[PDB]
Amino acid sequence: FDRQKSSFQTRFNVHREVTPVELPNCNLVKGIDNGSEDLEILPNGLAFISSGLKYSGKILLMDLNEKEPAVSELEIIGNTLDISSFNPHGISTFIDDDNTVYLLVVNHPGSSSTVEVFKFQEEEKSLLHLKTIRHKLLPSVNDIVAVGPEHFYATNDHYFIDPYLKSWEMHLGLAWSFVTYYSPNDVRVVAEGFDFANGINISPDGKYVYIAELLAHKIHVYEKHANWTLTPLRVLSFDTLVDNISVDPVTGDLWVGCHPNGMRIFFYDAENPPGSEVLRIQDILSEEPKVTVVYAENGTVLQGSTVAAVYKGKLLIGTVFHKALYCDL
Ligand SMILES: [Br-]
Ligand SMILES: [Ca+2]
Ligand SMILES: [Ca+2]
Structure with a gap:
């Protein structure tokens, strides 16, 4: 009809401008200049940050207990990973009953996706690569x-896997994006039909899963069952493209x-760079979830925010290809 221009304008939110929401005392994190697309903070205040995403790659570490925390590059060791193509994207952590910390990292060596499993060796400031995971049901993994x-x-x-096909897929508005549950002997699709599913996380009691649908501007809440299956519970809509989701383990926010x-x-222009925005969502199951814009700017300081998390009154914000910001709340 040429109501394809209309779908494009709403999916890409092409009219949005940013009302500023300032915080006291924000500082750029020295040494992060090529992306900090995802990050996760352990209960002890150590923060992992993925960087150098292309569409060289590193996992960075900050100790947020420090007054002015410096970043260091974690050393990856092991012979089961080829670091020369390491191109990290979303991450997640898991702490076993013995307090072993595992870091799972989405990796894009060339056009493909894998999930790399590491063991974090705290004293050594290093990551021991353990396993490369790939699967037909993980064609184009985001987080x-x-x-x-x-x-x-x-x-x-x-x-699709091929970037040319992905580009058609996205611009055609097929909405064939989907979510997969992966485990050693049970891999299945758990939800499907998204327009660019992206961020994903879980409530601290493991009973709910949250999924960001970037181009629909939605966060989907699903009940998670004992058999690992997901059922749709509610859908929140926003006036912004939602990227990664972090969950505060104390509140569940x-x-x-x-x-x-x-x-x-999506169409980067140095003369008109992307801005940043961080939302906090409280009481997500209640009739009226409380949504607060905690930080928002037009990119004169931080461009292309993807992720935000809090730790003891500090907010750490990462971006897709730019810097990272560390703020007092
Ligand atoms: Br913007
Ligand atoms: Ca993540
Ligand atoms: Ca993402």
């Missing part, structure tokens, strides 16, 4: 949430990094 050392839910932001305007993030 995962770990529920065991090699067990996770994964979003696929596209159905969601902290979501967002892209107010889709044009600016």
Whole structure:
């Protein structure tokens, strides 16, 4: 009809501008200049950050207990991973009954997807690679949430693997993006038909799963059952493209990094760079969830926020290809 221009304008939110919401005392994290697309903070205040996403790659570490925490690059060791193609994207952590910390990392060596499993060796500041996971039901993985050392839910932001086909898929509005449950002897699709499923996380009691649908501007809440299956419970809508979801383990609150305007993030223009926006969502099961814009700007400081998490009154914000911001709430 040429109501395809209309679908494009709403999916990519092409008219949105950003009302500023300032915080006291924000500082750029020195040494992060090429992306910090996803990050996860352990209960002890150690923060993992994936960087150098292309569409060289590193996992960074900050100790948020420090007054002015510096970043260091974690050393990856092992012979089961080829670091020369390491291209990390979403991450997740899992802490076993023995306090072993596992880090799961979405990796895009070339056009493909894998999920890399590491064991974090705290004293050594290093990651011991353990396993490379790949599967037909993980064609185009964006993020995962770990529920065991090699067990996770994964979003696929596209159905296709080939970037040319992905591009058609996205622009055609097929909405074939889907979510997969992966475990050693049980891999299945758990929800499907998304327009660019992206962020994913879980409530601290393991009973609910949250899935960001980037181009629909939605967060889906699902009940998670004892048999690992998901059923739809509710859908929240926003005026922003929602990217990664972090969950505060104390409250269960969601902290979501967002892209107010889709044009600016998908078609990068240094003269009109993407801005940043962080939402907090409280009481997500109640009749009126409380949604607060905690931080928002047009990118004169931080461009393309994807993720945000809090730790003891500090907010750490990452981006797809730019810097990271550390703020007092
Ligand atoms: Br923007
Ligand atoms: Ca993640
Ligand atoms: Ca993401």
